[PDB]
Task: structure prediction
Amino acid sequence: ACSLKPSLQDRDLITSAEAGEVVVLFKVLANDTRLRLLHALARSGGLCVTDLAAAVGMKPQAVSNQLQRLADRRILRAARCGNNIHYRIVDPCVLRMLELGLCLIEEAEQQ
Amino acid sequence: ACSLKPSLQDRDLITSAEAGEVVVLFKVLANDTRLRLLHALARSGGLCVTDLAAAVGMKPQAVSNQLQRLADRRILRAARCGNNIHYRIVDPCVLRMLELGLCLIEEAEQQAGG
Result:
């Protein structure tokens, strides 16, 4: 089978409060639309809602509330000028989780 | 900062097809109790329901049901001899994602003075 990393075998059992915080992040990524939006935001380093909706092939109204909720959770920053709202990822934890997910997909391709 | 790692900036936008398999990984991990159970299993390299339920704050019967479900989803291997069932994590994707979670909890603690 597989075995926990040798240097991580000395950490005390994660507490419930510790688990809930990381679970918030896992919940955020456990959704294909959020994953795709976060991936698009990560490649570009930030897009307005019109360009973002375009990249993931959806109507802006289909993704606008989801982005706002991500900003509510302090995972994105929403910069409004006029009616243009530009989003970018400000939580590096969410980014590292996404990167590991991308690694697993490449490896699934056997590459 | 928050920039994507340069080696990963070339892959095309993840499709809904590729997103499906990784989303299932996050759904399994996106639960307080399951994550603590998975860590307790990862620390020890495998436990029975009685030791594992003692390790976390839970009753053996609830823990038992949780473990057979993870086994049903092929996250664990349930090794039975007699009436003793020993559970081990056999999904390495689950394992790396748990380990990343553990590193983030540690870095967060460090970064706030302890």
Notes: Chain A has one domain: 6-109. The domain at 6-109 of chain A is CATH 1.10.10.10 (Arc Repressor Mutant, subunit A).
